[PDB]
From a paper:
Env is a class I fusion trimeric protein that engages CD4 and its CCR5 or CXCR4 coreceptor to mediate target cell fusion. The Env complexes on the viral surface consist of three heterodimeric gp120-gp41 protomers.
Therefore, we conceived a triple tandem trimer (TTT) design, encompassing three successive gp140 protomers genetically linked in a single open reading frame. Moreover, the R6 furin cleavage site28 was replaced by a 15-residue flexible linker to assure furin independence, akin to previous uncleaved single-chain (SC) Env constructs. Negative-stain electron microscopy (nsEM) revealed that >85% of StrepTactinXT-purified TTT trimers displayed a native-like morphology, while StrepTactinXT-purified SC and SOSIP.v8 preparations contained substantial amounts of dimers and monomers. However, the overall conformation of BG505 TTT is similar to that of other native-like BG505 Env trimers. Furthermore, although the relatively low resolution precluded the assignment of side chains and their interactions, PGT124 and 35O22 bound BG505 TTT with similar angles of approach to those observed with other Env trimers. Overall, these observations confirm that BG505 TTT folds with a conformation closely resembling those of other native-like Env trimers.
Author numbering:
A (entry chain c): 7 to 67, 67A, 67B, 67C, 68 to 95, 95A, 95B, 95C, ...
B (entry chain f): 1 to 82, 82A, 82B, 82C, 83 to 100, 100A, 100B, 100C, ...
C (entry chain e): 129 to 141, 150 to 185, 188 to 309, 312 to 321, 321A, 322 to 398, 412 to 458, 465 to 473
D (entry chain G): 188 to 226
């Protein structure tokens, strides 16, 4: 499974590799973003492919006894991804499974107030005798928010479907919440308020039938 | 100098033959090694098998009883087939080119060396899901603006109602508009279907510019172009 | 013994060469026992038939280990005669080994002589002053071994790179056995090097003098040993404390007509029986660390077969 | 518990004396061979 690591922004990090070798090694260091194309940083302990910046480096085993640590100088927000450490040594055979995933985290990022937008059910969806209030949150950090629905003043607590926050291209987070209701209940209550609590701040968006 | 592009069905029934194809545009397929890797949710990524330039295959022992990899000569493509798939084979499949290096620590004559492999160039990746439920086409409903901030910047979007399975590709004006666009992760409703929404932030002075959202669901072969208007 | 391979994890070739063996053994108290494990070379154990094994010496002899303080490294020995007796040294540089010597001297003691027990290759011996000298009782008899003495020594580099460890285990009251504990680092093969060009040159100067008793035109060749016991068909010697047996097919593999370095794989023994009487066996206690010894090959023990072929040996 | 063991077991082998020899010391006169003397 995955093991966590926490590094400050701009400081150098040393990622430790598990299941260290018993003999001569030609290790591989792979960077994998969730769902994207994985990109290796190191194929031979020292060597890197063309295009990889000099910030990433791997420890050669110049004398037997050294461990494989992935050293990153000037850690930025884009370096936050999983890191796999493929291990090949003389004493062991064909290594099929990659090394344990290393969840790198870059602390001290600038927090962002959540950009919230509330959409009432569309006319064509109401034509289908269904309603889904859609509350979207974009461009916020850290990705830890709580969503609450309000009918006028009473909470809803029913028919709510919320996704875990997922990163976008802005290196901030994005999330969505769907409140499924019948058209009669949508027109029943005066207005509906989506409340997003981010850390100690709280943002409320209200929408009402025309 | 090599570009890889994965192509797969996205949905396969249980106990069948999953087939995916990786298209290569960079160079010849008989010069470098090639391999398949799969990323399953909740688990670390697994190395399943590889094919050499001399056309020799090797497979991971856990799935070697079920997997096979082939390489096309006329087409710059490499295919992967998996027999008798179950609910555990659902994953994002990546094709990758690989280079064979041998690491030597002693005398060449004695042996005392081993081959190590590394995958420098990868493909974008194709998602493959396994389920017995049939395919569903997405319903698209235009979420109109509220006429949202004080004035200038305002938000609109398109709601992709319940569908099956992932993913859904959403574009705007057939790719003409790119500023402020943001597509959000889908949600798995209790019905067993995914629903998403894609929004755009545009100035209120521009509001009509005839914004058309194009939704493509490959598993259902549905291309839906929907207009939005207040 | 209950024995397993040490899992090379590579192609299953030399897994038996070195083997992990667990067994029950006595302790300092008569009523209690202790179950322990060790590492045994392939050459010291034989199967039963499952993964059961047993020591080679059990069916044939009683076994005793050497005390770990005495060293098997040979040191010079000067042999001397008492009062009223003398040693006659012949100083002729072309002495055939038999017959009248014209220049004779007398001594009370010989020079420093190292008791090097070797086979097919004489190690750390004396050097011929000129040419290379060939000696045999009846050179025309193939049943008499041929002793070749060199004038230019050929250097040999022997090594076991396995970083072995010793494990002290109490067998009885006042008894501490020394097992092979573990192997630190890589598991490689013990082997010996000799420079190829020097060996070729010395083989040439050997055959030029061999032609003095068989003819200039007759073609002779060199091949490996023809068979017999282990100690005869191999280059057998004691390096660093442990007993090495090196395959010599890569040395005598040339046919010579009228007119970089090579390496030899070596295996390791520690259960050795005496070459005169079988019924007494010695266990060589394992030596810690990496073993490496450099020696001078200075002589050969060849055997004729009856063109001609020569095969080494001499047990 | 009340279990015990001999002191010599962990360190040495043990042998008992034969019960006929006496450890009582008796006089010893040390002497030199021919050609030597004691001062
Ligand atoms: C008795 O007789 C015996 C037989 O005659 C004799 O046996 C000899 O034993 C010794 C040891 O006991 C053996 O020595 C070993 O040699 C190994 C091989 O070294 C050769 O190969 C490497 C690698 O070659 C690749 O890379 C270069 C570029 O660097 C390319 O040009 C090559 O083409 C090749 O790359 C391609 O090909 C590969 C294979 O197809 C592909 O995989 C690859 O992708 C490419 O396509 C060369 O670099 C070596 O060159 C060096 O030596 C020459 C002379 O030959 C010198 O000019 C100069 O010094 C060169 O630097 C050589 O040609 C070694 O790997 C091995 O040493 C490693 O292992 C030990 C033990 O684990 C480590 O402690 C040690 O640190 C070494 O690790 C280094 O190297 C590896 C390999 O990359 C690294 O991964 C590792 O991190 C570390 O790198 C560090 O050091 C590098 C420099 O050394 C540096 O560049 C790095 O950046 C990093 O800092 C060991 O020395 C010897 O081979 C035996 N003899 C024979 C004939 O086999 C015995 O001695 C005799 N005597 C006795 C028993 O007493
Ligand atoms: C032929 O003679 C040579 C020397 O005359 C022998 O080489 C000697 O081998 C021994 C055992 O391998 C070496 O002893 C070791 O010395 C190192 C020194 O650092 C020490 O650390 C070890 O604990 C061990 O005592 C010895 O040094 C070495 N002599 C030289 C000059 O290097 C060789 O073994 C002889 N050949 C045969 C077959 O006996
Ligand atoms: C191996 O042979 C060489 C050459 O005969 C020996 O080197 C000689 O050693 C003697 C005695 O120590 C010296 O008097 C000579 O001057 C040395 N000559 C040279 C050229 O080095 C060497 O000692 C021999 N080694 C062994 C272990 O027998
Ligand atoms: C063989 O293994 C031993 C350990 O079993 C190694 O001994 C170490 O040597 C280094 C040398 O600086 C010391 O710092 C360590 O304290 C030693 N370890 C112990 C446990 O004593 C030895 O170096 C190895 N030899 C080879 C050739 O690999
Ligand atoms: C056996 O080992 C010795 C020493 O390890 C080798 O002799 C060395 O040769 C180099 C030549 O490059 C010299 O620079 C050193 O001074 C030599 N060492 C000594 C102690 O003289 C020798 O070449 C090896 N022989 C073989 C056949 O490999
Ligand atoms: C070691 O492996 C070899 C490989 O064929 C096998 O023949 C042998 O029985 C094995 N021995 C043990 C003790 O596992
Ligand atoms: C030691 O004796 C026990 C007796 O129960 C036996 O089970 C065990 O196999 C013996 N040890 C070995 C290595 O066979
Ligand atoms: C002891 O066993 C070995 C194993 O093959 C055999 O070669 C040898 O002849 C046996 N010795 C006796 C005396 O039975
Ligand atoms: C050795 O040389 C001497 C010198 O004449 C000779 O008499 C003798 O026959 C030779 N013996 C052999 C076996 O060559
Ligand atoms: C040497 O051997 C041959 C046959 O092998 C024999 O005829 C001859 O008599 C032997 N030489 C001596 C001196 O006995
Ligand atoms: C062999 O060659 C030598 C030259 O060193 C020569 O003196 C001798 O006469 C030759 N022998 C014969 C039989 O021709
Ligand atoms: C020695 O090596 C040769 C080839 O290198 C091989 O044919 C022969 O069988 C080997 N001898 C032994 C005893 O292993
Ligand atoms: C022995 O010589 C033959 C002929 O040159 C060669 O083919 C073979 O490889 C040699 N073997 C060894 C062990 O040197
Ligand atoms: C044996 O036991 C005694 C009891 O204290 C202890 O002093 C002594 O060191 C032990 N001997 C050994 C070799 O451990």
């Amino acid at each position: 499974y995955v093991s966590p690591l926490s590094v400050a922004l701009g400081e150098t990090a040393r990622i430790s590799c598990g299941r260290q070798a018993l003999g001569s090694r030609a290790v591989q260091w792979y960077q994998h973003k969730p769902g994207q194309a994985p990109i290796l940083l190191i194929y031979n302990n020292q060597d890197r492919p063309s295009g990889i910046p000099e910030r990433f480096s791997g420890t050669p085993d110049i004398n037997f006894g050294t461990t494989a640590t992935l050293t990153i100088s000037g850690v930025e927000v884009g370096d936050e991804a999983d890191y796999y450490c493929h291990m090949w040594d003389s004493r062991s055979g064909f290594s099929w499974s990659f090394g344990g995933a290393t969840r790198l985290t870059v602390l001290s990022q600038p927090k962002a107030a959540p950009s919230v937008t509330l959409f009432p059910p569309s006319s064509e969806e109401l034509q289908a005798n269904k309603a889904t209030l859609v509350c979207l949150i974009s461009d916020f950090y850290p990705g830890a928010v709580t969503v609450a629905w309000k009918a006028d003043s009473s909470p809803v607590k029913a028919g709510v479907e919320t996704t875990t926050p997922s990163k976008q291209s802005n290196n901030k987070y994005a999330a969505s919440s769907y409140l499924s209701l019948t058209p009669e209940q949508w027109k029943s209550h005066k207005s509906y308020s989506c409340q997003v609590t981010h850390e100690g701040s709280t943002v409320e968006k209200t929408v009402a039938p025309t | 100098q090599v570009q890889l592009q994965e192509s797969g069905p996205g949905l396969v029934r249980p106990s069948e033959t999953l087939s995916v194809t990786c298209i290569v545009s960079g160079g010849s397929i008989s010069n470098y090694y090639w391999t398949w890797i799969r990323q399953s949710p909740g688990k670390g990524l697994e190395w399943i098998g590889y094919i050499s330039d001399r056309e020799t295959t090797t497979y991971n022992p856990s799935l070697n009883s079920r997997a096979v990899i082939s390489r096309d000569t006329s087409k710059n493509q490499l295919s992967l087939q998996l027999r008798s798939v179950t609910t555990a084979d659902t994953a994002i499949y990546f094709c990758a080119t690989a280079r064979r290096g041998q690491r030597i620590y002693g005398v060449v004559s004695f042996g005392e060396f081993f081959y190590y492999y590394y995958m420098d160039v990868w493909g974008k990746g194709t998602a493959v899901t396994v389920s017995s439920a049939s395919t569903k086409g997405p319903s698209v409903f235009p979420l109109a603006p509220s006429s949202s901030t004080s004035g200038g910047t305002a938000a609109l979007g398109c709601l992709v109602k319940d569908y099956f399975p992932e993913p859904v590709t959403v574009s705007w004006n057939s790719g003409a508009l790119t500023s402020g666009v943001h597509t959000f992760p889908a949600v798995l409703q209790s019905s067993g279907l995914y629903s998403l929404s894609s929004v755009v932030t545009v100035p209120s002075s521009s509001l009509t510019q005839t914004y058309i959202c194009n939704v493509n669901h490959k598993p259902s072969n549905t291309k839906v172009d929907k207009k939005v208007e207040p | 013994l209950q024995c397993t391979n040490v899992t090379n994890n590579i192609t299953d070739d030399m897994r038996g060469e070195l083997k992990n063996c667990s067994f029950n053994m006595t302790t300092e108290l008569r009523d209690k026992k202790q179950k322990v494990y060790s590492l045994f070379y392939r050459l010291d154990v034989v199967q039963i038939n499952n993964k059961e094994y047993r020591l080679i010496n059990c069916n044939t002899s009683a076994i005793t280990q050497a005390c770990p303080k005495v060293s098997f490294e040979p040191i010079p020995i000067h042999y001397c005669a008492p009062a009223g007796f003398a040693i006659l040294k012949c100083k002729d540089k072309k002495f055939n080994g038999t017959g009248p010597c014209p220049s004779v001297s007398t001594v009370q003691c010989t020079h420093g002589i190292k008791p090097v027990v070797s086979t097919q290759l004489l190690l750390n011996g004396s050097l011929a002053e000129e040419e290379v000298i060939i000696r045999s009782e009846n050179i025309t008899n193939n049943a008499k071994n041929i002793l070749v003495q060199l004038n230019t020594p050929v250097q040999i580099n022997c090594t076991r790179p396995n970083n072995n460890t010793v494990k002290s285990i109490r067998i009885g009251p006042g008894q501490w056995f020394y097992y092979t504990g573990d192997i630190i680092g890589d598991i490689r093969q013990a082997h010996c090097n000799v420079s190829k060009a020097t060996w070729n040159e010395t083989l040439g100067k050997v055959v030029k003098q061999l032609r003095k008793h068989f003819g200039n035109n007759t073609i002779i060749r060199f091949a490996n040993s023809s068979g017999g016991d282990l100690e005869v068909t191999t280059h057998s010697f004691n390096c660093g404390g442990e007993f090495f047996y090196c395959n010599t097919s890569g040395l005598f593999n040339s046919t010579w007509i009228s007119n970089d370095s090579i390496t030899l794989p070596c295996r390791i023994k520690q259960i050795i029986n005496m070459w005169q009487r079988i019924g007494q066996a010695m266990y060589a206690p394992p030596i810690q660390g990496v073993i490496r010894c450099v020696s001078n090959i200075t002589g050969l023990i060849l055997t004729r077969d009856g063109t001609e072929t020569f095969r080494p040996g001499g047990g």
